[PDB]
């Protein structure tokens, strides 16, 4: 199978504070090397590598091509942002929280208690563990956020314990999709 050649083009809009402050950044990427780009805060093209020189100088000439690009920030960015805001920016699916120990073993034996939170969107959430109402900050091993690729996230937050009877463990989840924190206890 012959050699491969890849041309890639990306216009990315980064929104800060909601809509006040947007940055358009147009990148042309040949193979894995970016060659030229348009950065809204610099108003014009700039070759990043030598092969992007011709174009950075070419397009930079067309005072019309540069006239629009600079306005793409509201004609394209702020636009597309207000088009999907209802379903993207304001998407909220609710987290589904579960508490279960891995490795059923006897009490007083080290056990890793797992808090699986899955199905949520947006990715911003907060998971805390409590042992007998007092927050347990240590021995908390997390998988970090995991993006399912279907517009929902998931993450696993484990607490290392040595359960004595009656100790009650709680998992508290805070997510924009909910008013008051989801909690879920586990009895020794």
């Amino acid at each position: 199978t012959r050699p491969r050649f890849l041309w890639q083009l990306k216009f990315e809009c980064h929104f800060f504070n909601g809509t006040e402050r947007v940055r358009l950044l147009e990148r042309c990427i040949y193979n894995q090397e970016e060659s030229v780009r348009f950065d809204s805060d610099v108003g014009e093209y700039r070759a990043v590598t030598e092969l992007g020189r011709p174009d950075a100088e070419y397009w930079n000439s067309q005072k019309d091509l540069l006239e629009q690009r600079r306005a793409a920030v509201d004609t394209y960015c702020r636009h597309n942002y207000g088009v999907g805001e209802s379903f993207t920016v304001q998407r909220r699916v609710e987290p589904k929280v579960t508490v279960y120990p891995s490795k059923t073993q006897p009490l007083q034996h080290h056990n890793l208690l797992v808090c699986s939170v899955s199905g949520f969107y947006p990715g911003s959430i907060e998971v805390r563990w409590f042992r007998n109402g007092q927050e347990e900050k240590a021995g908390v091993v997390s998988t970090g956020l995991i993006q399912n690729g279907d517009w929902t996230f998931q993450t696993l937050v484990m607490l290392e314990t040595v359960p004595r009877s009656g100790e009650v463990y709680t998992c508290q989840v805070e997510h924009p999709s909910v008013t008051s924190p989801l909690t879920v206890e586990w009895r020794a």
Binding site: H110, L112, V140, V141, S142, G144, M158, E160
Partner: peptide, 10 residues
């Protein structure tokens, strides 16, 4: 990293 990463073994 948003916060200290714990990688576990037992």
């Amino acid at each position: 990293l948003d916060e200290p990463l714990l990688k576990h073994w037992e």
